[PDB]
Amino acid sequence: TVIVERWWKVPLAGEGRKPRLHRRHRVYKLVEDTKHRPKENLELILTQSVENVGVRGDLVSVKKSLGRNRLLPQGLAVYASPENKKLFEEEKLLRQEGKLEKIQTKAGEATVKFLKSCRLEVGMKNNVKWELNPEIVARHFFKNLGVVVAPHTLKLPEEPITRWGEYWCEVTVNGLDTVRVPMSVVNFEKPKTKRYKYWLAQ
């Protein structure tokens, strides 16, 4: 929106009288064009689960381009009106009372999606005898896969591992979604050595 103001002062017209406009009052100076203002986010309430925005019932502030073109037209989100806000607020209150969420927070859904398609390389050093426990396994998630996993959430196959091979790890997110990820026990290599041998050569 183009906003302009008159160079010349318009004489007062009084109560119930239209102002008298001379031809010099047509002279305008640009005050501000609103298209150059910084863009503001749009407040919406999600109805479905989005890959990165969030899940149903979450107040998300997204770009106006994203909300007006993708979320609103496809029904993924609705306006955060006071009526809509109260509805979803009551919805989550009933879900808490009924213990029927099983939907995960904004971060939890992304973790599950990553954990569905991933493989962990548990580098174990050959020289020193090693026994795999959920505390050790969760360490490799932070290093290799970059996932912070609570030690208690991990469920090892309960068979002690002292030899290199293939196993499975069960990962549970928020006590709701249980993900069984592949496990590959390979001889440990230093990351500076490993990156030189494979990434640099190929």
Partner RNA sequence: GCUACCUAAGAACAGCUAAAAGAGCACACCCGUCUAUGUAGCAAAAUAGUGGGAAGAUUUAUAGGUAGAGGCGACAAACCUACCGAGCCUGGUGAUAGCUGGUUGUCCAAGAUAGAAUCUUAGUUCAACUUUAAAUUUGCCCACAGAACCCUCUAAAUCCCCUU
Partner RNA sequence: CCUGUUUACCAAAAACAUCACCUCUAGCAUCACCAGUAUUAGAGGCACCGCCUGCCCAGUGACACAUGUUUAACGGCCGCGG
Partner RNA sequence: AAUUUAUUAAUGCAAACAGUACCUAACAAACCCACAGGUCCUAAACUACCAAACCUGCAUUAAAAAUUUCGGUUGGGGCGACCUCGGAGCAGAACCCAACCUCCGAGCAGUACAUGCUAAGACUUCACCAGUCAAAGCGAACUACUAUACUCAAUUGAUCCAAU
Partner RNA sequence: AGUAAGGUCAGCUAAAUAAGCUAUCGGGCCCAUACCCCGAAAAUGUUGGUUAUACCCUUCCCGUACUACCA
Residue ranges in contact with another protein by CB under 8 A:
1-2, 4, 7, 26-29, 34-35, 42, 64, 68, 73, 79, 81, 84, 104-105, 107-108, 110-111, 114-115, 123-125, 128, 130, 135-136, 139, 142-143, 146-150, 152-153, 171-175, 188
Breaks (C-N over 2.5 A) in the chain follow: none
**What's the CA gap between 53 and 128, in Å, rounded?**
45
Among residue numbers 3 through 42, which ones bind Mg ion (CB under 5 A)? 14, 20
List the beta bridge partners of residue 4. 30
The yes or no reply on residue 1 touching RNA (CB under 7 A) is no
Q: Compare residues 26 and 68 and give the one whose CB is closer to Mg ion.
A: 26
**What's the CA gap between 7 and 25, in Å, rounded?**
7
**What's the CA gap between 7 and 4, in Å, rounded?**
9
Q: Are 123 and 141 in contact (CB under 8 A)?
A: no
Q: Compare residues 18 and 201 and give the one whose CB is closer to another protein.
A: 18
The yes or no reply on residue 152 touching Mg ion (CB under 5 A) is no
Contacted by 194, from RNA, another protein, Mg ion, none: CB < 5 to 8 Å by type: RNA
Torsion of CA 50, 54, 58, 59, to 10 degrees: -100
Among residue numbers 19 through 58, which ones bind RNA (CB under 7 A)? 30, 33, 35-36, 39
For the bound state, the minimum distance from the C-beta of residue 31 to RNA, rounded and expressed in Å, comes to 11
Q: Compare residues 4 and 13 and give the one whose CB is closer to Mg ion.
A: 13
Among residue numbers 119 through 158, which ones bind RNA (CB under 7 A)? 125-128
Q: Are 125 and 187 in contact (CB under 8 A)?
A: yes
- Count CB atoms within 10 A of the CB of residue 148: 9
- Count CB atoms within 10 A of the CB of residue 104: 18
- Count CB atoms within 10 A of the CB of residue 123: 18
**What's the CA gap between 200 and 193, in Å, rounded?**
10
Contacted by 65, from Mg ion, another protein, RNA, none: CB < 5 to 8 Å by type: RNA
Q: Compare residues 20 and 63 and give the one whose CB is closer to Mg ion.
A: 20
List contacts with RNA (CB under 7 A): 2, 30, 33, 35-36, 39, 64-65, 68-69, 125-128, 187-197, 199-200
